[PDB]
Amino acid sequence: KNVPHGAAHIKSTFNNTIVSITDPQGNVIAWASSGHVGFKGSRKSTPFAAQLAAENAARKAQEHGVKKVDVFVKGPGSGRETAIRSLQAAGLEVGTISDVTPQPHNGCRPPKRRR
RNA sequence: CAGCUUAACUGUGGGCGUGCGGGCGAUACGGGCAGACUAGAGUACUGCAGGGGAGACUGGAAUUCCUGGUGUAGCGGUGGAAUG
Secondary structure, eight states: OOOSEEEEEEEEOSSOEEEEEEOTTSOEEEEEOTTTTTOOGGGGGSHHHHHHHHHHHHHHHHTTOOOEEEEEEESOOSOHHHHHHHHHHTTOEEEEOOBOOOOOSSOSOOOOOOO
């Protein structure tokens, strides 16, 4: 309902860019993905899709009263910084950035190498 | 060398018979026997490094799953998609 300070969790993969604006406790109040802002397939992986996703989630959060946001970015992607700029432009102001990508300690064998 | 005319062939004598057995010598090398030595080898002492190995216990990250909140419509995935 009212959350002045929030957290923007950004999962930017090689196939999408999901953005979840949450309270600092982690309860989501808004989110947006490329598919939600009207994309499909491989265009979801573009930075522009992340621009729009971040913009839409930021607007839905502004509706709830979110001004300062701390970012928690994860995933290689290409629309990370694009989403940062989008949040900065969609009315919010970013306080802190953090690469929270999972770094396993050599556990859980990955999938095989693509040929 | 000699003789059948020559040669082949034949004969005579020597050498060969690459060895073996006896005898008599030599003893450098190998070997045997009897010893000696420490430069090899191994032991001892002091130190040192090391994911060497085995057993037991145990740690955190991460994935997955479960449960519960928030949370809503897509996620995932590809060269692009579709199954899902």
